[PDB]
Amino acid sequence: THCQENSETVALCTPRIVIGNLPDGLAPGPFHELRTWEIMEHMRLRPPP
Amino acid sequence: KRDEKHRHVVNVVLELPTEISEATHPVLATMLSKYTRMSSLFNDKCAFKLDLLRMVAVSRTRR
Amino acid sequence: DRQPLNPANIEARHHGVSDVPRLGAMDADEPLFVDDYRATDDEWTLQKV
Amino acid sequence: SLQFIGLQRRDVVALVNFLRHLTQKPDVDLEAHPKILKKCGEKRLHRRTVLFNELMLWLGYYRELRFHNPDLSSVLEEFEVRCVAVARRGYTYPFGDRGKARDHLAVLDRTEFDTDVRHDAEIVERALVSAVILAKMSVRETLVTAIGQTEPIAFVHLKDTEVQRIEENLEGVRRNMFCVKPLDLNLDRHANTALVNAVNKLVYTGRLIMNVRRSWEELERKCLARIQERCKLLVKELRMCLSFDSNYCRNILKHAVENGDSADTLLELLIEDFDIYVDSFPQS
């Protein structure tokens, strides 16, 4: 991102420490639901309690 | 006569029955000094009646 | 009644106090009486719904 | 009229004489006269009585302060004339980059007042920003181009003595709103460019009008906040004594006062039937 400073503009960078940070235009909301279903399937909790 | 005006109000205007008067009803005794100030609106008895009703309503309120 | 009312025409409602002139003016047209609590926009929208 | 509970006659007449002599004295703010505020009589009379006293004093003060009503239309007209003159000077003058000057002149050259108390301050703020940026561009002094960091309102090329005098005059304006006086800045004609002379006169006028209107608004805000807090505290205190006269007093006080005319209506109704509910307040 570009950021504001006193009478100045500067560039800023930061680490996307969780995958959730990706914009939902590139990683849509339903994609996380299906991936969570896949996590539960791998752990054999597919029908949750 | 001040008593003449008081009787005029409490008889012609409010039409309150004789057995209830200023000596017995305290809030009416306090209110009636204000009412004689208003020379007009004597044609509308219902307005005065409903004003006295809402005044005795707050007089015995709980909140 | 006829002309869009200016704020001066708006009268203040008097709950719980002796206000017999407004009682005599119930059948009157112009001196509109309004409650003190104006409706906020969210409650406005909910009531409209 | 203003009348209140329990105090001796001399104190009451002194306070009411204080209210009418508000215009001539300096430092019009009520906080600047703490003796009047303490004259309400804390520790002398019962707490509910002194709350009623203070609410009455504040409400009468608001009535007087609103009534004085600094309707400075003459200064408004003079500022409009100066704005037209500055627009003409902007038209006649040359520049190194004409487009920006034309844009700021276009935002300048139509700023007639919309006959509302609130709108004049913001529109004069915008017009003054445009005038200052135009003057600085005319001198070819540097101007803050940083985004959002808009050019501040300030004089240009005026001597330190004159700006000190002007700042002291504006501080006095802040001290007393009702009867401020204009000035001619003792501006020279031999030195400096004429467009800067015109814009300096204009910016002085704009600073004066902004300061006086802002001070009046600040006093109104403070008075409304204090009266609302006093009313809230008083109704909370009196709520415990459930009785007809006390409940009538509560029903009077329950009205909001956020708009000044509503506060004036509350004053009118509170005066109109004072004898009805006086018994709730214990004297001495």
PDB file of N, CA and C in Angstrom, chain C residues 3-44:
ATOM      1  N   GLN C   3     -50.060  26.785   3.227  1.00  0.00           N
ATOM      2  CA  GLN C   3     -48.669  27.052   2.905  1.00  0.00           C
ATOM      3  C   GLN C   3     -47.766  26.155   3.732  1.00  0.00           C
ATOM      4  N   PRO C   4     -46.655  25.676   3.174  1.00  0.00           N
ATOM      5  CA  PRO C   4     -45.705  24.895   3.974  1.00  0.00           C
ATOM      6  C   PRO C   4     -45.289  25.658   5.221  1.00  0.00           C
ATOM      7  N   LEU C   5     -45.465  25.020   6.375  1.00  0.00           N
ATOM      8  CA  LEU C   5     -45.342  25.705   7.653  1.00  0.00           C
ATOM      9  C   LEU C   5     -43.884  26.017   7.972  1.00  0.00           C
ATOM     10  N   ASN C   6     -43.642  27.239   8.437  1.00  0.00           N
ATOM     11  CA  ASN C   6     -42.336  27.607   8.950  1.00  0.00           C
ATOM     12  C   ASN C   6     -42.145  27.025  10.352  1.00  0.00           C
ATOM     13  N   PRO C   7     -40.900  26.922  10.825  1.00  0.00           N
ATOM     14  CA  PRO C   7     -40.678  26.363  12.170  1.00  0.00           C
ATOM     15  C   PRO C   7     -41.394  27.120  13.277  1.00  0.00           C
ATOM     16  N   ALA C   8     -41.657  28.417  13.094  1.00  0.00           N
ATOM     17  CA  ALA C   8     -42.367  29.180  14.116  1.00  0.00           C
ATOM     18  C   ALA C   8     -43.771  28.642  14.356  1.00  0.00           C
ATOM     19  N   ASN C   9     -44.416  28.104  13.319  1.00  0.00           N
ATOM     20  CA  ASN C   9     -45.773  27.590  13.480  1.00  0.00           C
ATOM     21  C   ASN C   9     -45.804  26.324  14.325  1.00  0.00           C
ATOM     22  N   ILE C  10     -44.701  25.575  14.368  1.00  0.00           N
ATOM     23  CA  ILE C  10     -44.654  24.356  15.167  1.00  0.00           C
ATOM     24  C   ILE C  10     -44.714  24.722  16.643  1.00  0.00           C
ATOM     25  N   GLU C  11     -45.689  24.161  17.349  1.00  0.00           N
ATOM     26  CA  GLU C  11     -45.834  24.359  18.781  1.00  0.00           C
ATOM     27  C   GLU C  11     -45.260  23.165  19.533  1.00  0.00           C
ATOM     28  N   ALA C  12     -44.885  23.398  20.786  1.00  0.00           N
ATOM     29  CA  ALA C  12     -44.249  22.384  21.616  1.00  0.00           C
ATOM     30  C   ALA C  12     -45.310  21.667  22.440  1.00  0.00           C
ATOM     31  N   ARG C  13     -45.367  20.344  22.303  1.00  0.00           N
ATOM     32  CA  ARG C  13     -46.300  19.548  23.086  1.00  0.00           C
ATOM     33  C   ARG C  13     -45.930  19.600  24.562  1.00  0.00           C
ATOM     34  N   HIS C  14     -46.946  19.679  25.419  1.00  0.00           N
ATOM     35  CA  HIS C  14     -46.759  19.795  26.864  1.00  0.00           C
ATOM     36  C   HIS C  14     -47.431  18.605  27.545  1.00  0.00           C
ATOM     37  N   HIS C  15     -46.680  17.516  27.694  1.00  0.00           N
ATOM     38  CA  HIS C  15     -47.184  16.360  28.422  1.00  0.00           C
ATOM     39  C   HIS C  15     -47.095  16.586  29.927  1.00  0.00           C
ATOM     40  N   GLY C  16     -48.151  16.195  30.635  1.00  0.00           N
ATOM     41  CA  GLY C  16     -48.136  16.175  32.085  1.00  0.00           C
ATOM     42  C   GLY C  16     -48.213  17.516  32.777  1.00  0.00           C
ATOM     43  N   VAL C  17     -48.524  18.597  32.057  1.00  0.00           N
ATOM     44  CA  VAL C  17     -48.680  19.916  32.659  1.00  0.00           C
ATOM     45  C   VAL C  17     -49.952  20.556  32.120  1.00  0.00           C
ATOM     46  N   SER C  18     -50.442  21.556  32.848  1.00  0.00           N
ATOM     47  CA  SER C  18     -51.690  22.210  32.473  1.00  0.00           C
ATOM     48  C   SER C  18     -51.490  23.090  31.246  1.00  0.00           C
ATOM     49  N   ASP C  19     -52.064  22.660  30.123  1.00  0.00           N
ATOM     50  CA  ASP C  19     -51.922  23.384  28.866  1.00  0.00           C
ATOM     51  C   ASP C  19     -53.255  23.493  28.136  1.00  0.00           C
ATOM     52  N   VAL C  20     -54.298  23.937  28.833  1.00  0.00           N
ATOM     53  CA  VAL C  20     -55.655  23.991  28.284  1.00  0.00           C
ATOM     54  C   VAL C  20     -55.780  24.770  26.969  1.00  0.00           C
ATOM     55  N   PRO C  21     -54.963  25.796  26.659  1.00  0.00           N
ATOM     56  CA  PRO C  21     -55.102  26.415  25.327  1.00  0.00           C
ATOM     57  C   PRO C  21     -54.874  25.458  24.166  1.00  0.00           C
ATOM     58  N   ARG C  22     -53.936  24.512  24.277  1.00  0.00           N
ATOM     59  CA  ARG C  22     -53.766  23.544  23.197  1.00  0.00           C
ATOM     60  C   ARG C  22     -54.940  22.574  23.149  1.00  0.00           C
ATOM     61  N   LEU C  23     -55.520  22.258  24.310  1.00  0.00           N
ATOM     62  CA  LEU C  23     -56.711  21.417  24.338  1.00  0.00           C
ATOM     63  C   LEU C  23     -57.866  22.092  23.613  1.00  0.00           C
ATOM     64  N   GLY C  24     -58.019  23.402  23.805  1.00  0.00           N
ATOM     65  CA  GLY C  24     -59.008  24.152  23.054  1.00  0.00           C
ATOM     66  C   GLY C  24     -58.689  24.270  21.578  1.00  0.00           C
ATOM     67  N   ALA C  25     -57.435  24.044  21.196  1.00  0.00           N
ATOM     68  CA  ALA C  25     -56.996  24.157  19.813  1.00  0.00           C
ATOM     69  C   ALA C  25     -56.876  22.809  19.111  1.00  0.00           C
ATOM     70  N   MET C  26     -57.484  21.751  19.658  1.00  0.00           N
ATOM     71  CA  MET C  26     -57.392  20.440  19.022  1.00  0.00           C
ATOM     72  C   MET C  26     -58.006  20.452  17.628  1.00  0.00           C
ATOM     73  N   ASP C  27     -59.151  21.116  17.468  1.00  0.00           N
ATOM     74  CA  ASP C  27     -59.797  21.203  16.166  1.00  0.00           C
ATOM     75  C   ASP C  27     -59.163  22.250  15.259  1.00  0.00           C
ATOM     76  N   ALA C  28     -58.205  23.026  15.761  1.00  0.00           N
ATOM     77  CA  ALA C  28     -57.520  24.005  14.930  1.00  0.00           C
ATOM     78  C   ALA C  28     -56.560  23.310  13.967  1.00  0.00           C
ATOM     79  N   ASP C  29     -56.333  23.958  12.825  1.00  0.00           N
ATOM     80  CA  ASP C  29     -55.557  23.363  11.743  1.00  0.00           C
ATOM     81  C   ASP C  29     -54.052  23.587  11.879  1.00  0.00           C
ATOM     82  N   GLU C  30     -53.622  24.847  11.916  1.00  0.00           N
ATOM     83  CA  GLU C  30     -52.220  25.191  11.697  1.00  0.00           C
ATOM     84  C   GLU C  30     -51.293  24.935  12.884  1.00  0.00           C
ATOM     85  N   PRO C  31     -51.643  25.333  14.124  1.00  0.00           N
ATOM     86  CA  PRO C  31     -50.638  25.158  15.200  1.00  0.00           C
ATOM     87  C   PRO C  31     -50.390  23.692  15.534  1.00  0.00           C
ATOM     88  N   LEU C  32     -49.637  23.034  14.654  1.00  0.00           N
ATOM     89  CA  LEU C  32     -49.312  21.624  14.826  1.00  0.00           C
ATOM     90  C   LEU C  32     -48.490  21.407  16.090  1.00  0.00           C
ATOM     91  N   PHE C  33     -48.841  20.369  16.843  1.00  0.00           N
ATOM     92  CA  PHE C  33     -48.151  20.023  18.077  1.00  0.00           C
ATOM     93  C   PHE C  33     -47.313  18.772  17.850  1.00  0.00           C
ATOM     94  N   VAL C  34     -46.035  18.838  18.218  1.00  0.00           N
ATOM     95  CA  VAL C  34     -45.085  17.757  17.985  1.00  0.00           C
ATOM     96  C   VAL C  34     -44.464  17.344  19.311  1.00  0.00           C
ATOM     97  N   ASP C  35     -44.239  16.042  19.469  1.00  0.00           N
ATOM     98  CA  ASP C  35     -43.554  15.539  20.650  1.00  0.00           C
ATOM     99  C   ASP C  35     -42.073  15.900  20.591  1.00  0.00           C
ATOM    100  N   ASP C  36     -41.451  15.984  21.769  1.00  0.00           N
ATOM    101  CA  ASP C  36     -40.072  16.460  21.848  1.00  0.00           C
ATOM    102  C   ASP C  36     -39.100  15.495  21.177  1.00  0.00           C
ATOM    103  N   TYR C  37     -39.272  14.195  21.392  1.00  0.00           N
ATOM    104  CA  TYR C  37     -38.315  13.206  20.898  1.00  0.00           C
ATOM    105  C   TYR C  37     -38.470  13.053  19.391  1.00  0.00           C
ATOM    106  N   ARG C  38     -37.562  13.667  18.636  1.00  0.00           N
ATOM    107  CA  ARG C  38     -37.514  13.435  17.201  1.00  0.00           C
ATOM    108  C   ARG C  38     -37.038  12.016  16.912  1.00  0.00           C
ATOM    109  N   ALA C  39     -37.566  11.438  15.836  1.00  0.00           N
ATOM    110  CA  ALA C  39     -37.225  10.068  15.478  1.00  0.00           C
ATOM    111  C   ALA C  39     -35.867  10.017  14.790  1.00  0.00           C
ATOM    112  N   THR C  40     -34.997   9.130  15.266  1.00  0.00           N
ATOM    113  CA  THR C  40     -33.700   8.932  14.638  1.00  0.00           C
ATOM    114  C   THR C  40     -33.860   8.182  13.321  1.00  0.00           C
ATOM    115  N   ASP C  41     -32.806   8.223  12.502  1.00  0.00           N
ATOM    116  CA  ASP C  41     -32.906   7.703  11.142  1.00  0.00           C
ATOM    117  C   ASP C  41     -33.098   6.190  11.113  1.00  0.00           C
ATOM    118  N   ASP C  42     -32.464   5.459  12.032  1.00  0.00           N
ATOM    119  CA  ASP C  42     -32.612   4.006  12.046  1.00  0.00           C
ATOM    120  C   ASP C  42     -34.035   3.604  12.419  1.00  0.00           C
ATOM    121  N   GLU C  43     -34.584   4.223  13.467  1.00  0.00           N
ATOM    122  CA  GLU C  43     -35.975   3.975  13.830  1.00  0.00           C
ATOM    123  C   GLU C  43     -36.913   4.456  12.730  1.00  0.00           C
ATOM    124  N   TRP C  44     -36.557   5.559  12.067  1.00  0.00           N
ATOM    125  CA  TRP C  44     -37.304   6.020  10.901  1.00  0.00           C
ATOM    126  C   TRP C  44     -37.394   4.927   9.842  1.00  0.00           C
TER     127      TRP C  44
END
